[model samples]
Target: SGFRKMAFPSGKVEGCMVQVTCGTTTLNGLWLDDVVYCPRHVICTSEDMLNPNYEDLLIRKSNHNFLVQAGNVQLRVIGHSMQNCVLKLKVDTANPKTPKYKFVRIQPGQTFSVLACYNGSPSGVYQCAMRPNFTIKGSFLNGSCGSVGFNIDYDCVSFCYMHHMELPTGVHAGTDLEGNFYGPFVDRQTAQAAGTDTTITVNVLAWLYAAVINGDRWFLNRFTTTLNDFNLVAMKYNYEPLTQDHVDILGPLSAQTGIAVLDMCASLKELLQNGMNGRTILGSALLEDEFTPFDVVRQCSGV
Candidate 1:
């Protein structure tokens, strides 16, 4: 529903004459034209910078359409003449060493489409530029075709996860090995008497999964912000935001919830270590008190 008009500058000689639109909003800029004009690159990012939660994006050109997964993607279009044009799509896979790349040539009336990236993919920055001969030192280009009037459309899908995880039925209170009576106590006194410790090794993965399943906005917001900060830090330091193993662990969780949980605990742990208040990270409207367990298993176990 969000759409806006775009304006283009007059008398620009270098970049391609193109019009880009996202819903009602439009952006007119110098894009792929000639090799020397490549200095003025046009970059289209997958996620909204101001709001990371706005992750869904749809791109359409010619008759092709793609619903990009929420992640970092850079789309670069390059053309030398009216006859040959190249489209390069790069995906930030969270690994500094290996980024996914896709290249396609679009002819007049032809449609090309691709998924920006996959779920659980880490977010990062991406840029697009043109060079002579359509070649990078390490990257090779496919044969190019020419078209100047192709139409492109960009759209951001606005949606939210409303479902929450329901606690498995028939869960009963239980005691721990320390001879403490444990069960879902209604009061803090009862919980404390049962030897439940709030500081126990929290299963952060489980907590995140539960939060996503429940569509807990407070937790989700904090989690997303912390992760974005981590990615920024990683970029500045030239480090990988999330390792392969970390991504593997989050894969199943993300698939189940349709919400990206990039880092299992590092980002949250970093915030806690930095002396930020723990309550802010862990606090939620659903909690009756600080001592209340956030997940069903923890609440029932009282350990």
Candidate 2:
């Protein structure tokens, strides 16, 4: 990402035009007329399908953990062009509200770990989904081909948002050594021979701590959405077909309240059903007052 300052004709940015560039993306906007991405919530947490092609990728539980271990949390990821990836250590991962995954980039047959230190002790959870960038190569031309992160558990569960582990065991219970060591939150459903989904329970505790400490209006907060919990998936509120509308109603509600917007776009049946190349959210909402658009985007679930 580059650091080129955007120039505005007038010091006051209301109705004035400004141009800015970062990495390869460029954005132009007017001060008052255009509400730039001022990032009310610069930090967020959520989930992305480690392998966009996985039949089912999601945070299916209400409370989950975020564990960082080696071996393979997500297998069958050749799109990025790799046979096997490893994790030995955990790092302070970022769980953006955006429907994205930030994986640590590695070469073919490369090995890496997700381990971090807290109070001088090696701790933290390694994210299965996500590459180095907050972007995951969605499915290619074929819809059946890419990661389909079920739920971007950014809200009420972002480890990066705060550090108030409401639960005793943090996010993940204990050392999930290579999926070989049996532990808690093991998802026999997805596991080949009854493997596990170790990230949820652990990660859930992450945001809880942040909630107790940060609360609302902590630092510079921007977006917030009170969406249906995954446990309520059976209910109409959490239905996939109603995603856009749900996001429509909820996203704006948060921005209107001055909270960062974290969309739960993990499972978009309508968009993905279209086949080949899904759309990246229309973004922003039509304001009640003069239809002003709220363009600021990020992931934040207030605990």
Candidate 3:
């Protein structure tokens, strides 16, 4: 139902493609090339990102994905490493004595926390180095990841977690590959496949899940902007821009709704065999001020 175009056959076009019929116009869409097509959320497509909320497939494919999960906030030094790392933090910046060093005994995978210093406090053992070991260093934390703790370190790191704490339901709360925290991100779409929460504004659960499916990128700022500008979700939810809060509330509900959005979207095509009346569907599913992600999967499937 979105975007339209015409095409010849196989050789003329490549990669995954979707066709849309607009009266006399034929719309052909292609977002990837030869990439395996999978469904659930994120329009198209993880150990699925470091934590599973999402990930940067492109970078993880070419370079590396450095994830930060802090164990302690104030006094304690908290950091996690997965063998090779791209970024770094001091654990203690302020001032230092004979330069610094990296933790040699710190095992890969899982997290590592230390309250004791190398030398011992007024002058303890302070090591700072990239996960894979690098000579060069960056001045500030990546704005897209998460928050900055004491003095940290790493390279090409995109996502970060302030605390190892879990979020609402299917969504896990954290920051982008940058330093700024966006909010909670849904890990799965299946959570909302049943009962839909009609009180919500944006159906970010399905939308973001579609994003992860479409190839979870390093920085989702542009991706998020595109979703808002896309008007598809805004049109459905009364023209209000989708916010981090909306994503948080609807994410859990949409998770339970599962692929209901996909089914409903697909059913919109009249030429398709599935029958879906927007009025009846949305009318039965949505409430006065609230919105929900479920519909067809329940009605059509008799669930």
Candidate 4:
């Protein structure tokens, strides 16, 4: 996207007006009064899905000797314990909260191996950890459980979010590799539409395109509805929805700059979902309390 700066006049007698041009798209904005309010976006973590018992516990680390080899349902659990003790093993590849299989009362003190199989690929080495029943002094094991990870690789045979190992059938990355990776024409329609229906950055941009370039309300409605519904979907993911305080701030100005406001909010939602920050894409000017309608218009037009 080619970027250019345009000045907005806030000193006009008939309220302030700003126009920003990005390529062929020009998004316009108007300030009704001196009171310009920037609404706050919601942000939260996976704490909604977090279990009480697992909240403070850290994932166990395994030494070089404790490892798991790939298997077809059945895999080998190699124990590398120094002392004699009963071992309890729990295996789960994808989700940490649930285990696929559990093996109890295994003998220790050797490079021991146990054979077991459970449903699912347990594809990755699984969190399969070996914990002891007896107590090892704080000076000994230092209160640590031995664990290993399976299928550890980010190799992208295809471009979707998941790696090749977990790739769904018949799903192309839907965009070109070399030239158009980031250059528009990404067909996330199936990807976005097929899922649990969450608002994504591209989906928001689609509405902005219609509003800014095509001069249509269809995209605007689509964008706003999706954004409004975001609060419901966000519940499962632990993200906080904007409160009345946020709407109270936006007030009447919300209609004119709702696009930019929700864009920022949706961008923030993306950040929380993906475990990242959009500081680069979304500059601080729009994030500040004093953010004006001018700032949102400028940002909507690629400032």
The ten-residue window of minimal lDDT in model 3 covers 114-123
- In model 3, state the lDDT of residue 243: 52
TM-scores for all candidates: the values are 0.19, 0.18, 0.18, 0.18
Please provide, for model 1 over 122-151, each residue's C-alpha lDDT reduced to its tens digit, 9 standing for 90 to 100.
Answer: 111111111111111111111111111111
List residue ranges in candidate 2 displaced over 4 A. 1-267, 275-303
By TM-score, the better pick of 1 and 4 is 1
Report each candidate's C-alpha RMSD, comma-separated, in the order given: 25.2, 22.0, 24.4, 26.3
> Per-residue CA lDDT of candidate 2, range 32-127, in tens?
111211110111112321223221221221111212211222111111111111111112322122222222222111112222222112223222
- List per-prediction Cα lDDT, in the order shown: 0.26, 0.21, 0.24, 0.24
lDDT at 272, model 3: 22
Which runs of model 1 end up more than 4 angstroms from their true locations?
A: 1-203, 222-242, 263-303
Candidate 3 lDDT for residue 97 = 23
What TM-score would you give candidate 3 relative to the actual structure?
Answer: 0.18
Q: Whose lDDT is greatest here? A: 1
Relative to the true structure, candidate 4 reaches a TM of 0.18
Per-residue lDDT value at 39 in model 4: 7
What are the per-residue Cα lDDT tens digits for candidate 4 across 158-264?
Answer: 11111101013321111111112111212122222112212222222322332333233322232333556656655555433544444444333345544555554
Candidate 3 regions exceeding 4 Å error are 1-157, 160-164, 176-179, 184-234, 237-303
Compared to the true structure, candidate 1 yields what TM-score?
Answer: 0.19
